[PDB]
Curated annotation (Swiss-Prot), chains A, B:
Substrate binds at residues 92-96, 131, 178, 205. This is Queuine tRNA-ribosyltransferase. Catalyzes the base-exchange of a guanine (G) residue with the queuine precursor 7-aminomethyl-7-deazaguanine (PreQ1) at position 34 (anticodon wobble position) in tRNAs with GU(N) anticodons (tRNA-Asp, -Asn, -His and -Tyr). Catalysis occurs through a double-displacement mechanism. The nucleophile active site attacks the C1' of nucleotide 34 to detach the guanine base from the RNA, forming a covalent enzyme-RNA intermediate. The proton acceptor active site deprotonates the incoming PreQ1, allowing a nucleophilic attack on the C1' of the ribose to form the product. The gene is tgt. Gene3D superfamilies: Queuine tRNA-ribosyltransferase-like.
Length: 358, 358
């Protein structure tokens, strides 16, 4: 396989489906990437993650640099070897968590150069440029300032990535668009990123307090500013309905802690909407979490059993809920991909929303 | 298969190896039974428990009657169906946890009749008689009193078990020997239990504060008092070296929370003795937990990785440590069984101790 190749197999309106080819494997898009916080996808073995249908997972640069440490992971053979996942891994830049001067942030120090270096040490396949994230809400002036600084940092990220032969030859680098909710700033950011040139483009600075309406509004004008022939990554999104709407607006890649996090909380996603398995109504319910879900949990265990485990604080409860939720997300992405390929994604989105919010 | 059949295939001194045949499967002895506290073997799917080599697991009557409740479990199809384990399950009587009058204990009420009933509701394959457990230390007089009461309760358990057709035809009932550390009391208890007649006999009231020397001393005279042709079950034992010594003294069945419990704590069992994986010396150790262990954890993950997970409080750390420890226990039982079959258990025990305590 090549270092990086994105090919669009089918389109319906702004929606696209296709594949990203990388050295460690193929990523089907639109893609959902389970999040590995501390070199583990919470409560799941890597084989189980893969079995749900995930093609790629996300590693957190901020957490890993603190524990166990980027240099230590490199010494142990890199993140893939360390955690036992041999498929692609995307690493975030640390910009969101660390949230200062033009050189970078101290807190430990983090700069475009150090972020790139850490992601190299981890052996990341998709490296994220180091950005400054504009809080929401933000004045036009402050958003411009942050966006401008992030573009300077994007250039610095690009140069640091390119200066490392092994990294430049084997990994990909994504730039991150900023600019808050302002069309002009988004435009300038997109223009700047494209001038620099990246393998993929992320829409950053969303899902930070604004509602879905506003997020969708910003996506409407922002995604078409990005190069059409490269992947579009919406960071930290999100709920199933957020995902469907973002694909309708041209997004190809997603990540969120939601399915793992809310799993441990007792929230299970279903085609009829989320349920909280702790609710007493499930104490004697012999049905699986979802009657259509094809995951291993739904094939074997009842709502009543999982209800009991989650109420009792048992680790197996977290394991089963997380597997289900991640498998649900992958099934959602599969149905999205199929519907786009078949030119019926518009209908799928409508049918999906009608049932999920019934 | 029959309701219950124990056959002794081979002997070396007091040690025996063989099989217990039951409707839901065959149990190879000497056997180690992982403990399921709240209808789950902590941090493991039933398939994973089985994959380690376990033939039977233990369910706790006291915990299950409180949550989710014995009647509810029956309504949901019984414990096997509820938790997804279809092989034999032994249930304890609740006597130890609940630790009063001749009728039983209130705290909820527990009597020989209610204990038997609860174990019927769970659908247990091996039912334990309801006993009174003598605290350690105990005067000769108090131990006699408790032992005498437990024998009266053993009769009541027997009659309650026999009064339920479905239970008597499909499950087995074990009596429990008491009598503290006193040979005469142990003798009277064994005589009483045999007069009543049970499918198996447990040595109760040990591992309650006495040392290994004293436990072994009591086992020396107590196990030969029990019927030779029936299984001998030492409850709540124990460490690997306890197990080897107890088999040398004629014990066929074991259970302990140790491998699960100490797993989550960071303690990993190895042929060279236990290690605590949290120790800084393992932070960059690329070796598996045990260099000889054939378990899935040891095939894939390093000491360094598990060290990181356990220090970070990650659920996967608990999962991997517990799988390893349970697999270690099963490998220990397999080596014991093989050595007895080959008439070299004496040598195995010696070699085992030399290395484990080196
Ligand atoms: N570097 C970076 N990481 C991020 N994670 C999540 C977001 C926005 N949601 C974000 C970003 O805007 N930049
Ligand atoms: N019923 C009963 N349960 C028990 N669990 C553990 C022990 C002794 N260790 C015991 C007992 O002596 N009786
Ligand atoms: Zn499912
Ligand atoms: Zn192992």
């Amino acid at each position: 396989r090549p270092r990086f190749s994105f090919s669009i197999a089918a389109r319906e309106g702004k929606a696209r489906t296709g594949t990203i080819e990388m050295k460690r494997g193929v990523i089907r898009t639109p893609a959902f990437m389970p999040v590995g916080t501390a070199a583990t996808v919470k409560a799941l073995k890597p084989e189980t993650v893969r079995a749900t249908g995930a093609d790629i997972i996300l590693g957190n640069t901020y957490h890993l640099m603190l524990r166990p440490g980027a240099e230590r992971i490199a010494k142990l053979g890199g993140l893939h070897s360390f955690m036992g996942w041999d498929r692609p891994i995307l690493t975030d830049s640390g910009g969101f968590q660390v949230m200062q001067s033009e050189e970078g942030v101290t807190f430990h120090m983090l700069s475009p150069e150090r972020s790139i270096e850490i992601q190299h040490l981890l052996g990341s396949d998709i490296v994220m440029a180091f950005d400054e994230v504009t809080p929401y809400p933000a004045t036009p002036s402050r958003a411009a300032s942050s966006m401008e600084r992030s573009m300077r940092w994007a250039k610095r990220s690009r140069d640091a990535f390119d200066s490392r032969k092994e990294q430049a030859e084997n990994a990909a680098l994504f730039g991150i668009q900023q600019g808050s909710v302002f069309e002009n700033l988004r435009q300038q950011s997109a223009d700047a990123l494209a001038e620099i040139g990246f393998d993929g483009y992320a829409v950053g600075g969303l899902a930070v307090g604004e509602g879905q309406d506003e997020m969708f509004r910003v996506l409407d004008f922002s995604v078409p500013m990005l190069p059409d022939d490269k992947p579009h990554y919406l960071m930290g999104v999100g709920k199933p309905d957020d995902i469907v709407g973002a694909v309708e607006r041209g997004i190809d890649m997603f990540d969120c802690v939601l399915p793992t996090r809310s799993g441990r909380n007792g929230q299970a996603f279903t085609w009829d909407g989320p349920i909280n398995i702790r609710n007493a109504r499930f104490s004697e319910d012999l049905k699986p979490l979802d009657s259509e879900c094809h995951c291993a949990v739904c094939q074997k265990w009842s709502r009543a059993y999982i209800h009991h485990l989650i109420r009792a604080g048992e680790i197996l409860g977290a394991m089963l809920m997380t597997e289900h939720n991640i498998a649900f997300y992958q099934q959602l992405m599969q149905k999205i991909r199929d519907s786009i390929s078949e030119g019926r994604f518009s209908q799928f989105a409508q049918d999906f929303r009608a049932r999920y919010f019934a």
